[PDB]
Structure formats: structure tokens, C-alpha cells
Design a protein around this ligand. Structure first.
Ligand SMILES: CCCCCCCCCCCCCCCC(=O)O
Length: 133
């Protein structure tokens, strides 16, 4: 299953092409400002087979809880209502969000002790790197 190395508190130390990603998502202007400024902590935890990903920033949180492979309802930080699934592929924790006939993916993998999140929307690709705190 999910490597226990995902578990813990993660801090954003690098982000590339995130504005373009948000723009691809049709994110509102206020949300883009927030997104480009925020340097969130991501907390990954588990209770039995329920995995939780909590994202905390200065004055805004998001949280999802899920079982691998089981679709669930999600309200994203930019307020999309998506049907989402998190799966495990070759150690990569892969999230897909679907809404309005659209699709975006967030793939998280551990690389040299860091967590690398790759976001893709219509060929726009984001990379956000987290270090263990
Ligand atoms: C809740 C703190 C973050 C605020 C960012 C708001 C801008 C909209 C973000 C929507 C998609 C974000 C995906 C981030 C992936 C990650 O690096 O965990």
C-alpha cells in the first residue's frame, strides 16, 4: 500500500508553473492571488485504511479523506465540485478530479526524501515540491 514515508507534515519549498495551472482551471482572480502567495503545509495521515490529506495555509484549509480506489466527492480550494479518486501506481499517489466533463491530475511521489506533486490540466503541468518538517 501507500508507503508510510508519505505520512507526516510537509512544507512547500518550491513551485513552478502554478499560475498557469490555476489559470487552466478557470480559477477566480482572488483565488489566483491566494494560490501564488500561499506556501502551504500538507499533512498526510492515516486511520486504518482511510487516508487524509490536509492542506493548511495562513488563513485557509482544505481536507480530503479517502480510501484508495474509491471515488469520493470533493470541494477543491478553488470551489470546484469534483468526483475524485486516489490510486497507487508504482509508489506514486495519484489523484484524479473530474467535473463538468473536465479532468485534472495530481500525482505525488517521494523523490530523495521530498514529496513532489505534479499537477496537469490540458497539457499545463505544475510541479510543487515539499520537504518533511
Ligand atoms: C489551501 C491552501 C492552498 C491554496 C491554493 C488555492 C488555489 C487553488 C488550488 C487548486 C489546486 C491545488 C493543487 C495543489 C497540489 C499540492 O501541491 O498539494
Amino acid at each position: 500500500g501507500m508507503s508510510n514515508k508519505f505520512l507526516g507534515t510537509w512544507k512547500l519549498v518550491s513551485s513552478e508553473n502554478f499560475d498557469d495551472y490555476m489559470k487552466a482551471l478557470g480559477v477566480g482572480l482572488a483565488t489566483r492571488k491566494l494560490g501564488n502567495l500561499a506556501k502551504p503545509t500538507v499533512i498526510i495521515s492515516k486511520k486504518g485504511d482511510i487516508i487524509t490529506i490536509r492542506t493548511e495555509s495562513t488563513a485557509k484549509n482544505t481536507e480530503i479523506s479517502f480510501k484508495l480506489g474509491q471515488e469520493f466527492e470533493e470541494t477543491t480550494a478553488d470551489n470546484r465540485k469534483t468526483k475524485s479518486i486516489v490510486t497507487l501506481q508504482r509508489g506514486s499517489l495519484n489523484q484524479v478530479q473530474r467535473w463538468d466533463g473536465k479532468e485534472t491530475t495530481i500525482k505525488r511521489k517521494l523523490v530523495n526524501g521530498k514529496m513532489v506533486a505534479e499537477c496537469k490540466m490540458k497539457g499545463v503541468v505544475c510541479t510543487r515540491i515539499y520537504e518533511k518538517v
